[PDB]
Amino acid sequence: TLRSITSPLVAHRLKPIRQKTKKAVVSILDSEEVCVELVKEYASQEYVKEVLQISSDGNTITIYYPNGGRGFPLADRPPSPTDNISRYSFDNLPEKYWRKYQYASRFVQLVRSKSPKITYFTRYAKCILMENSPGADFEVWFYDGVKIHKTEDFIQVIEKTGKSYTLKSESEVNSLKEEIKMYMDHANEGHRICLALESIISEEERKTRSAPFFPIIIGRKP
Amino acid sequence: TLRSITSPLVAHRLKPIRQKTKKAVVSILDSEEVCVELVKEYASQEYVKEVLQISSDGNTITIYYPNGGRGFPLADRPPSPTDNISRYSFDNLPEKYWRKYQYASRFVQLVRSKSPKITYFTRYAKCILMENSPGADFEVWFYDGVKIHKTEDFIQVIEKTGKSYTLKSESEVNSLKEEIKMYMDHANEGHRICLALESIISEEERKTRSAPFFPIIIGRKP
Ligand SMILES: [Cl-]
Ligand SMILES: [Cl-]
Ligand SMILES: [Cl-]
Ligand SMILES: [Cl-]
Ligand SMILES: [Cl-]
Ligand SMILES: [Cl-]
């Protein structure tokens, strides 16, 4: 089952963006739909030959072949579909499209990892909870120039010149320079607070509202 | 009793600012202390002869007379105190100082009423809960050009041309134009949401004891 392999992408709250690779051009549209344009090379120009159009909730996939299946010149936006389409639920998408769905799925997931959900200004730092929940990335931009980038798999640290190093196990973190273990105590507190605030706002989001409660920016730089 | 005329001012979260009249200068300092410099003019130059230094919570008043009471030329910041001071709790400030305290008190009150606590972007409007709690001003900037400004004694409405009118009682509110009642029901929802969000966030702020949770910016303009 595809739902075993990955979860449906969710592009809610994500800003429009276009990524051009060798394999595809993946776009998050203004409607939060995600499109995968499979581009073919007929030198010099590239043609859009196939399009996967994925719904913002990730559960509807519309596949079509623009220009009668002959192709469209790759443009700034994807070609809109015609009544000639094939369409599937996520749970019903044939495997032949799984790899292409995941192009979108992954891109969305990457964009979420760079999309601020909650920004929290503290005395020493600017905290940013990202959108790739759960286990979202957590960035910490201290004003002195120190940068801490939290992940699920690791914790990055960038010192004031560019001394970059990646910390993994807690046993490796304890072994860090002792003026730094305090920076983490800040960064971890922000993280706890941001997570704390995310929870409370989501709860309030569930009840009657009129617009999303995310993103949120809390406070200001001094 | 002074507690009858005002509440101790509150300058938390308020941005630095300086206002000059002929008789005095009020500043909200970067520390959120509020100063009243009483100014007198001696041959073209103006001197600070008296200073009231009020705590950010409005409950401590330190009063002094710079340069021996002869004065210091009015500068960009108030003259700092010396060993020679008198200092009072709010409830203990002598009447001789009440009108000068009220000078700081009124100014702080004007600033809060113009200082955003919660900014909330909707599909149709930009809502801003001000800081003059309780009964804070709540202004609503619809994108189409309609403006609604909720206030303590009344509700102003500005239509797309400049049709300004004041509603003070339900009798004028029910009697409102029927399509305007639509703008108002939004505005009223925004207020409830913003008030709801204010309460839930302050509560979590109390437990955390770290950088403030206000102001916030919720969402984005479409
Ligand atoms: Cl291009
Ligand atoms: Cl349709
Ligand atoms: Cl098919
Ligand atoms: Cl959510
Ligand atoms: Cl929503
Ligand atoms: Cl002292």
Curated annotation (Swiss-Prot), chains A, B:
Post-translational note: Acetylation by KAT2A and KAT2B impairs kinase activity by shifting the kinase to an inactive conformation.
Ranges for domain Cryptic POLO box 2 (CPB2): 115-222
Induction: Down-regulated in HCT 116 colorectal cancer cells, leading to aberrant centrioles composed of disorganized cylindrical microtubules and displaced appendages. Down-regulated by p53/TP53.
Domain of life: Eukaryota
Compartments it resides in: Cytoplasm, Cytoskeleton, Microtubule organizing center, Centrosome, Centriole; Nucleus, Nucleolus; Cleavage furrow; Cytoplasm, Cytoskeleton, Microtubule organizing center, Centrosome
Residues with the Phosphoserine modification: S80
Stretches assigned to the Cryptic POLO box 1 (CPB1) domain: 1-114
Domain notes: Cryptic POLO box 1 (CPB1) and Cryptic POLO box 2 (CPB2) domains can simultaneously bind to both TENT5C and CEP192.
Function of the protein: Serine/threonine-protein kinase that plays a central role in centriole duplication. Able to trigger procentriole formation on the surface of the parental centriole cylinder, leading to the recruitment of centriole biogenesis proteins such as SASS6, CPAP, CCP110, CEP135 and gamma-tubulin. When overexpressed, it is able to induce centrosome amplification through the simultaneous generation of multiple procentrioles adjoining each parental centriole during S phase. Phosphorylates 'Ser-151' of FBXW5 during the G1/S transition, leading to inhibit FBXW5 ability to ubiquitinate SASS6.
Self-association state and partner proteins as the record states: Homodimer. Interacts with CEP152 (via N-terminus). Interacts with CEP78; this interaction may be important for proper PLK4 localization to the centriole and PLK4-induced overduplication of centrioles. Interacts with CEP131. Interacts simultaneously with TENT5C and CEP192. Interacts with TENT5C; this interaction leads to the TENT5C recruitment in the centrosome. Interacts with CEP85; this interaction may be important in cell migration and centriole assembly.
Family statement drawn from the similarity comment of this UniProt entry: Belongs to the protein kinase superfamily. Ser/Thr protein kinase family. CDC5/Polo subfamily.
Record's disease association: Microcephaly and chorioretinopathy, autosomal recessive, 2: A severe disorder characterized by microcephaly, delayed psychomotor development, growth retardation with dwarfism, and ocular abnormalities.
Protein name: Serine/threonine-protein kinase PLK4
